[PDB]
Design a protein around this nucleic acid. Structure first.
Ligand SMILES: [Zn+2]
Ligand SMILES: [Zn+2]
Lengths: 89, 895
DNA sequence: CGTACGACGTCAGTCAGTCGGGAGGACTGTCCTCCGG
């Protein structure tokens, strides 16, 4: 089943043979089969672990700071910004 | 009384800023080292300035300490001086509010009293009008009196070397360089800078500036964070030494309060993460000092110096060196303590006691060297290494020679170069060992100028020690380049020893240079016998601007010798390299700008863009004249050498062709010249025919040259191939050094020398005018040193016993200014004649190293432009505003 | 001097190649009902 890295990236049929394969072989490229990427399980128990801890950190957050701040953090991607937020106390 | 440990500071760029306490109109002075006549040296004219708290819009106060920001990897240009009142005045040099300036002109950033921003360029006192400022003496030690000032480094890493050892297997010295990760407290990039100061009352300060703003901020605390202000204002700290520790964001504030008679320890913590950094303090430990020794003699604490120790050493705990003197006895005891955590199954553990036979009057810690200097009463200095506290000047005698690594050398002081009889400390205002430990700076009460003392060696008549000495001085520069130090002190010391050698045997001194510079290549892992790929890296390398400068000074005394001439022509060819290939890349990008910006012709931005395109090529014409004038000189020597091959005074011609990268370098210059001409022919100027003169002149000067470039191109190409097959015929690596530095052919290769004479005649001269080239006027090339300095001073002025450095007062009356030192006739960067207007305007610069004079970095007059106009254009000479061609510093020439 | 022919340059059109939206579909795991223990 697994297509080689390059065929994946390019989205063309892979011959998939061993070691290399038609277009990496032909075209002159180093053909690889990368490991599947580890992702979190998409189960319902796990979505619920995570929604319900996020909820409880939100509940605790609100005893400490205003709701308007909740909404800012819940969007920040930068670690300086998450820290500065906290520094304006 | 304790000496002025921080009265003077040698900036990493060579500027010597020291406190002034005698002039009634100034409190600070600036100076630097410059070469008199290529052999001797003298300090520059003192640039006096006055510092008072009210520069922002009148009495001025004395200067307490001067701290250049040369710590770690900092640029070392921002000088912050703290006065006796406690005000911290920050001065930035090398920058102006509107433009860039040289390193001898100051500028303010902000003044502290509350802090406010006020940018203002300072002016010298002598040039300024007589002002109503009197020297008010603040003889009171205020609560805000700063005890110790410390700078904060950035996140950059520093790579230095620790030591070298003699590899007896290969009979050569080998050195290893270890990268030093930052330790202690470092400020993040988004903060422009930060600094810390401890005041005598215990109040701390933290100045910092945000990189995205101009406003400055200050945060202050107090050490004794008690609930009562009664004890807050009591901590009169006798000694407050701040030593950063490997703990993150921690500084060990080792203080000695005489109120409680204990050496109290503290810890300071800072959280960088745009919010202001938070400062925290935590008390740790306090101990009492020992009253007596083992035999029953009481002790007195003279000084408390703690060493700034990194994590490299075996035990990173800082050494608290509490000095004690046995009264009425010449002995002096230095007890050593270390701070360590208390372990279960903090505290101070005593390691050992060290006895010194003379009383100590000053202690100074070296930077990036790990050397404690004991300035005894009799003037002698015994620098003990931090690793083992073994005397550096006597380590060779007591070294265990047997072992894997033999003859461990860290500095030229290990060889035996000891300082002479220094002036007694009572007469001395302040001392400071030079950064390379080659000499000591002494400021005298009755001497209006700084003195200088170099190291001497008693056994100069023994020839067998030349092998060790050359290697020892070779490693001295290795540490200096890694720390970006000018190392002008080390250059003076090397020349004095060579001069004493040449007085007895001139032949011996020449070999000393060759062996000395050879070890530099081995230490830095650069090989002149390597394949051609590394050779390209060599040409662009900064060290050649300095290592070649070494023989430029170490070979100056040898008149009619080609050691300095060979280095200068290669060095000037590098300047020639920066001319064409420096603009060939710039001109290439201008081709693409034409096509993409052809859709808007009437815009007011294209017209200035079009004008600048054809103006740049005009300034290359004066450079090309010296380019042609240079190749004719070597061709002229070909005809002369054929008749008389036995003339040793004309051996420079051999080395020039022997250099391997020079043949390729000229070929590359000829390659881009062909490319530029082909591109200009392919893409000529069509909108304005009047602007085609510069483009047309470029074609004409090449065709009208007395010798065809194509014939000369094949000349150097054939030499490379013949010199490569000879390497395969017999393997040898000294010939690579000989063709590059010695500019000679070894006697074992005498047959090779005959080939150059015979083949050069029929190759290129057959296509040129023989009669014309011989009588051609190639004079004024500024190649020899004799035609750089004026003939009045181009000689030795004082005997070698009196030293090599000369005070200005001994110079002739007409030769006591920098204007009379050199020939101010020709330019050195653009290779253009200097008119009377450019001479008299005082906007030209002189190099303190090689004596060169250049008006680079300034707007050119309208008569030198393509068309006389008042439009100001920033020309390429702006690259050398602060750095000369030989990596020396450029300064405004005094009028 | 005027006309004609040739050569070069520029523009347009067509073809190929590549990034991309996403169809196809085996599969993972959900989330019902309700069996039978
Ligand atoms: Zn594939
Ligand atoms: Zn593949």
């Amino acid at each position: 089943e697994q297509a080689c890295d390059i065929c994946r990236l390019k989205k063309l049929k892979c011959s998939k043979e061993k070691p290399k394969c038609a277009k990496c072989l032909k075209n002159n490229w180093e053909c690889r089969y990368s490991p599947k990427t580890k992702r979190s399980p998409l189960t319902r128990a796990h979505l619920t672990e995570v929604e319900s801890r996020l909820e409880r950190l939100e509940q605790l957050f609100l005893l400490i700071f205003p709701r308007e701040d909740l909404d800012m953090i819940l969007k920040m991607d930068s670690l300086q910004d998450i820290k500065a937020l906290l520094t304006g106390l | 009384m304790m000496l002025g440990e921080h009265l003077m500071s040698w900036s990493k760029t060579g500027i010597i800023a020291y406190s002034d306490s005698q002039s009634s109109n100034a409190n600070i002075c600036l100076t630097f080292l410059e070469s008199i006549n290529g052999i001797n040296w003298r300090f520059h004219t003192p640039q006096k300035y006055v510092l008072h708290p009210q520069l922002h819009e009148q009495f001025f106060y004395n200067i307490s300490s001067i701290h250049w920001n040369n710590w770690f990897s900092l640029p070392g240009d921002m000088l912050a001086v703290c006065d006796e009142l406690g005000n911290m005045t920050m001065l930035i040099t090398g920058q102006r509010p509107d433009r860039a300036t040289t390193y001898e002109k100051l500028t303010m950033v902000f003044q502290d009293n509350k802090i406010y921003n006020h940018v203002m360029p300072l002016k010298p006192v002598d040039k300024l009008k007589p002002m109503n400022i009197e020297r008010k003496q603040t003889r009171k030690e205020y609560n805000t009196s700063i005890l110790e000032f410390r700078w904060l480094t950035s996140s950059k890493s520093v790579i230095v070397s620790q030591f070298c050892a003699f590899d007896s297997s290969s009979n050569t010295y080998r050195s290893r360089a270890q990268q030093v990760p930052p330790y202690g407290v470092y400020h993040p990039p988004f903060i422009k800078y930060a600094c810390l100061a401890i005041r005598k009352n215990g109040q701390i300060d933290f100045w910092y500036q945000f990189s995205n703003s101009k406003d400055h901020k200050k945060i202050t605390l107090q050490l004794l964070d008690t609930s009562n202000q009664r004890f807050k204002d009591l901590q009169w700290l006798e000694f407050a030494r701040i030593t950063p520790m490997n703990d993150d964001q921690c500084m060990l504030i080792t203080t000695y309060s005489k109120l409680s008679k204990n050496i109290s320890f503290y810890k300071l913590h800072v959280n960088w993460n745009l919010n202001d950094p938070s400062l925290k303090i935590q008390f740790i430990l306090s101990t009492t000092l020992d009253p007596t020794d083992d035999e029953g003699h009481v002790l007195k604490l003279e000084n408390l110096h703690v060493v700034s120790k990194s994590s490299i050493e075996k035990d990173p705990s800082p050494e608290i060196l509490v000095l004690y003197n046995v009264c009425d006895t010449s002995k002096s005891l230095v007890k050593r303590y270390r701070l360590a955590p208390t372990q279960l199954s903090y505290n101070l553990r005593r390691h050992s006691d060290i006895v010194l036979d003379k009383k100590v009057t000053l202690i100074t810690s070296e930077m990036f060297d790990a050397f404690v200097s004991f300035y005894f009463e009799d003037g002698t200095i015994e620098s003990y290494n931090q690793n083992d506290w073994k005397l550096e000047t006597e380590r060779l005698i007591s070294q265990s020679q047997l072992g894997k690594f033999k003859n461990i050398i860290a500095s030229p002081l290990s060889a035996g170069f000891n300082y002479g009889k220094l002036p007694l400390p009572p007469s001395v205002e302040w001392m400071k060992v030079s950064p390379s430990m080659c000499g000591v700076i002494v400021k005298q009460y009755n001497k209006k100028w700084p003195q200088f003392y170099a190291a001497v060696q008693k056994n100069y008549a023994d020839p067998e020690k030349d092998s060790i000495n050359a290697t020892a001085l070779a490693f001295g520069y290795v540490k200096s380049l890694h720390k970006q130090i000018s190392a002008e002190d080390l250059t003076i010391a090397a020349k004095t020893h060579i001069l004493r050698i040449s007085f007895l045997d001139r032949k011996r001194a020449k070999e000393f240079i060759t062996t000395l510079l050879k070890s530099l290549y081995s230490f830095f892992n650069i090989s002149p016998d390597a394949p051609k790929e590394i050779m390209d890296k060599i040409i662009t390398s900064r060290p050649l601007q300095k290592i070649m400068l070494l023989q430029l000074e170490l070979g100056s005394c040898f008149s009619q010798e080609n050691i300095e001439e060979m280095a200068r022509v290669i060095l000037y060819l590098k300047n020639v390299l920066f001319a064409f290939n420096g603009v060939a890349r710039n001109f290439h990008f201008a081709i693409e700008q034409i096509s993409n910006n052809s859709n808007q012709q009437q815009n007011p931005k294209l017209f200035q863009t079009i004008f600048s395109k054809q103006d740049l090529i005009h300034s290359l014409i004066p450079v090309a004249k010296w380019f042609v004038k240079f190749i004719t000189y070597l061709t002229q020597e070909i005809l002369i050498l054929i008749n008389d091959p036995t003339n040793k005074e004309y051996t420079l011609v051999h080395g020039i062709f022997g250099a391997k990268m020079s043949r390729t370098l000229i070929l590359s210059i000829l390659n881009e010249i062909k490319k530029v001409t082909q591109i200009v022919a392919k893409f000529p100027e069509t909108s304005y025919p009047i602007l085609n003169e510069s483009s047309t002149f470029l074609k004409l000067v090449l065709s009208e040259s007395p010798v065809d470039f194509e014939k000369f191109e094949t000349f150097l190409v054939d030499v490379n191939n013949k010199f490569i097959a000879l390497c395969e015929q017999q393997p040898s690596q000294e010939r690579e050094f000989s063709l590059l530095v010695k500019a000679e052919i070894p006697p074992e290769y005498a047959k090779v020398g005959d080939f150059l004479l015979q083949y050069a005649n029929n190759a290129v001269i057959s296509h040129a005018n023989a009669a014309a080239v011989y009588f051609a006027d190639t004079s004024g090339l500024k190649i020899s040193n004799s035609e750089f300095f004026n003939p009045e001073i181009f000689h030795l002025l004082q005997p070698l016993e009196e030293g090599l450095i000369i005070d200005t007062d001994k110079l002739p009356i007409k030769n006591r200014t920098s204007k009379s030192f050199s020939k101010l006739l020709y330019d050195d960067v653009t290779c253009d004649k200097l008119s009377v207007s450019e001479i008299s305007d005082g906007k030209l610069k002189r190099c303190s190293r090689c004596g060169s004079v250049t008006r680079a970095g300034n707007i050119i007059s309208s008569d030198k432009t393509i068309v006389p106009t008042s439009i100001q254009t920033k020309r390429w000479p702006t690259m050398y505003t602060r750095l000369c061609i030989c990596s020396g510093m450029l300064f405004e020439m005094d009028g």
